[PDB]
Each structure stands twice: as C-alpha cells, then as structure tokens.
Amino acid sequence: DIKMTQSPSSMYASLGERVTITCKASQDINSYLSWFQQKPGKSPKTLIYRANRLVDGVPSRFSGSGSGQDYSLTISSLEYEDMGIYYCLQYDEFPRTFGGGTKLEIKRTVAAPSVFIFPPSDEQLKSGTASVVCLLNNFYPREAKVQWKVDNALQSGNSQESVTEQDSKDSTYSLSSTLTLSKADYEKHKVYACEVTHQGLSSPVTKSFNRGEC
Amino acid sequence: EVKLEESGGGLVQPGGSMKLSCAASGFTFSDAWMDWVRQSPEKGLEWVAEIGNKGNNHATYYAESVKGRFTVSRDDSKSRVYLQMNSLRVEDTGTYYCTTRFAYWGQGTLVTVSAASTKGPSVFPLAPSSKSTSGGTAALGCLVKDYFPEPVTVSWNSGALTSGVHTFPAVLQSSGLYSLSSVVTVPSSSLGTQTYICNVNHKPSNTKVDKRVEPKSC
C-alpha cells in the first residue's frame, strides 16, 4: 500500500495569510492526487484533482502543485470559511489511500473563559447517578486545564471533556467537563469544585457549590 | 447539479449483514466510475470499493479489509450504486460515503456494528445558578445522557434561539453509552421572564424530548 503523509498535522493562520500544506507519497504516484476540505459533520469537498487541476465551484485562491512523491496545496490568501481539515488521496494504484489530514484553524486574540458549575439535577439523582458539569465558555487558545475536587480530594479518572470547534459564528472554543459519581458518593460529600487554568487568566478560577444549598 | 444520497445504514450486530444504496442524479450515470469510502475517528478516511462504468464492464475492486465480505454493484437504469456488507465486524463501524470516483460526495450514512441495544436518552437540566451575576451573564443547558447509537441533535426554543449556544461533541462513556451536553448563555435579567427549552432528537430510538430548563426553586 502507498502511504500518504501530510504535514503539518495542524496549524493556525491569520485572515488573509498564505497557507501551504504538504503531502508525500511513499512512492511515485504520477500526479494522480486529489485534495479535499472537510468541515465537522459534513462530507469531503474536492478542491484539486490530478495534482494541480482546480475543480469547478472552488475559489481560485486554492492551487495544487508537485510531482513524483511530493505535493502541496496552497491557499494564496486565507478566508475565514477555509477553516477545516484538508486531506490528500492517491489513485495511482489500488488500494486508494488517504493522508491523515491537516487541520487548519484561524488565529485570533487570547480570550479567558467564563466558568460555570452545575450540580446534578434532582431528576437524575432519582436513578442512582450524579453528573456534575463544569463549563468553560468562549476561550482562546484551546489549551486549558480543568481540575475537579470533592471535599478537597482531587478527582482523577472519573471525568470526561468535550470541546467545540471554531465555526461561522465563533472563533473561540468552549469546553464541558463532566464528573460522574454514584448517588451514594455524591450524598456523602459537601463541596464540589472545578478549578480552571488558562493563559488568559492571571490565576486559576474556581467555581464551586455546596450540596443541598443554593 | 450532481447529487448523491446514501441510505441503508443503522445499527447491526457483529456477524450481521446490511445493504447500502446510493441514489445519483445530475450526470450520465452509466459513464461514471463509482466508489465507496468510509470514515471513522479511529482510522480516518478509508477507501472501500470501486466499480467501473459500463465501458469498463462494471469491474469491481476492493480494500483487502473487506474482500470476500463486501460486494459493490450498480443498476445503471436506476442510477444506483450499492454496497452489500456481510459478516460485519465492529471495526466496520463508520460513516459510509458514495462518490463519483472522488469528484463529488454524498452526505454519508452511519453504520454502527455493535452488540449493544438501541437506547434513547434521558434529558436532565443544567439549571442556571442562583448566584448568576446581577446584570451579568448566566449559563444554562441540558445534559443528554445514556443513548446508543449515535447521533443526537439539539436545538433551543425550536430553533428560535441560536446565539450563545454551544452543543458539544458526544463522549463515549465506560458503559458503552454516549452522553452530550448543550448550553446557552443568556442575560441574567432574562431568567425570570424568558422560557428556555432544549429540543432533543435521537432518531435511532425514535425519541424526541422537549426539556424546559429553569432556575431551581430553593
């Protein structure tokens, strides 16, 4: 099988900047190479075929180049809608093989998150489980640390995080962290706290509640 | 305009069988080579099968991963390509796309190969804090817990509220069930006056839930 390797795996660029990403095949593929853009939850959109032919309906700022094993995609001047993941594909031989993708995101100013903590609902507790949720709203860059404490005991291994992507309405990220406890454990403790570290904050921010208070 | 639309996916048990179909229009179908490609968070994009146009006698080609189990076919009179999948394996899970030899792509059909049963979600409120800063911004949401398979969609106020909404990617829990959250930020001033309802749809279980989220009484 022909291995397709893309570089970089991910990058940021500012509005209007020139962007070049590369795709290297483990052997000569004779320019039988296509490039695609994919946005979250959507199908791939073909940009370039046969290494350098622009597809109809694709802006002229996209161009492909290269030969032999080494290919490149260039965006002459980035537009906001160009965020997404870009893939290459060879069809010189069977099997057809894809690169691993290059994620392209847009640069913008640092933003500190606003932080919110949510106790488990009484409705959920009726069923034996407690979910405690910490929300980090509208921050940039993506790196952030969420620390859970229950009566000052650091919680490790019983939380899961999910993060949004930039999109047409938002150039910042948001993140939810969910701490899962049994009802019996939840009702044996008082202080529930989420502590957030982010470079936009001077010091970490902690949001907490006491079980059974408002 | 070229259009492609896949159908046939859903939940199926390991060892089972499932047939996908792709409806095509906007080009001379018999002259087009067609392909199936699948995508997963795990393995990325993977080519599955290719079938020749009429001039190439509908010749077929397969990824070694699926050879002997999958069969690609086409009905030119119907402008349809098909993928018959037998002896399905957990690792065949993914979004399956039909494509005109990589020029145009359908929206995809999700194939979930799993022994787990379909389960609709429970929807729980993420109630706005009683300490919401006066004159400031409050957050509220809904927790969509314990469903299978994917996917779930969420809207707020039947689509009338979109500003400030963040609907997070689902997470797979240790139980094998998914959970996701959707939140919205609103003026603290509006919590006493406005109504907030999250509309949850889990089509795989035919489950729809409208959950009104309000401040907890005290």
Domain final position from A106, A136, A169: A106
Instruction: Please check whether residues A69 and A96 belong to one and the same domain.
Output: yes
Instruction: Please check whether residues A10 and A77 belong to one and the same domain.
Output: yes
Instruction: Please check whether residues A83 and A175 belong to one and the same domain.
Output: no
**CATH topology for the B122-213 domain:** Immunoglobulin-like (2.60.40)
**What contacts A185, CB < 8 A, 6 or more positions away?**
A130
Give CA separation, A166 vs A85, A90, A139, A163, B40, in Å: 12, 29, 11, 10, 21
- Token pair listed for B54: 């009429």
Sign of the CA dihedral running A198, A199, A204, A209 = negative
Domain final position from A78, A106, A134: A106
Say yes or no: do domains B3-113 and B122-213 share a fold.
Answer: yes
d(CA B170, CA B154) in angstroms, rounded, equals 11
Matching residue, tokens 């320019």: A31
Instruction: Please check whether residues A91 and A14 belong to one and the same domain.
Output: yes
Number of domains in chain A: 2
Cβ within 8 Å, pair A118-B137: no
Q: Which of B44, B162, B170 sits opposite A98 (nearest CB)?
A: B44
**Local structure of residue A93 (DSSP, 8 states):** S
Cβ within 8 Å, pair A174-B168: yes
Minimum distance, in Å, between the CA of residue A200 and any CA atom of chain B: 19
- Token pair listed for A100: 């691993």
Minimum distance, in Å, between the CA of residue B54 and any CA atom of chain A: 20
Locate the domains of chain B by residue range.
Answer: 3-113, 122-213
Give CA separation, B155 vs A135, A175, B204, in Å: 18, 18, 17
* Interchain CB contact of A168 with B (< 8 Å): no
**What contacts B187, CB < 8 A, 6 or more positions away?**
B136, B137, B138
d(CA B60, CA B73) in angstroms, rounded, equals 8
| Resolution, Å (one decimal) | 1.5
**The domain containing residue A63 runs over which residues?**
4-106
Q: Which of B91, B82, B65, B69 is nearest to B23 (CA)?
A: B82
Instruction: Please check whether residues A100 and A119 belong to one and the same domain.
Output: no
**Local structure of residue A207 (DSSP, 8 states):** E
C-alpha angle A33/A37/A38, rounded to 5°?
Answer: 130
Instruction: Please check whether residues A80 and A20 belong to one and the same domain.
Output: yes
Pick the residue of A88, A96, A208, A210 with the most B CBs within 10 A to test the interface with B by mutation: A96
Q: Which residue of B has its CA nearest to A55?
A: B103
Instruction: Please check whether residues A98 and A133 belong to one and the same domain.
Output: no
Domain at A35, CATH number: 2.60.40.10
Instruction: Please check whether residues A178 and A206 belong to one and the same domain.
Output: yes
Instruction: Please check whether residues A8 and A102 belong to one and the same domain.
Output: yes
Instruction: Please check whether residues A93 and A121 belong to one and the same domain.
Output: no
What are the counts of helices (DSSP H) followed by strands (DSSP E) for chain B?
A: 0, 18
Matching residue, tokens 């076919």: B73
Instruction: Please check whether residues A100 and A143 belong to one and the same domain.
Output: no
Cβ within 8 Å, pair A124-B122: yes
Domain final position from A106, A128, A146: A106
Give the phi and the psi of residue A175 in degrees, each rounded to 5.
-140, 140
Matching residue, tokens 């039988």: A32
Please state the separation of Cα B214 from the chain's center in Å. 29
Domain B3-113 has CATH 2.40.50.100: no
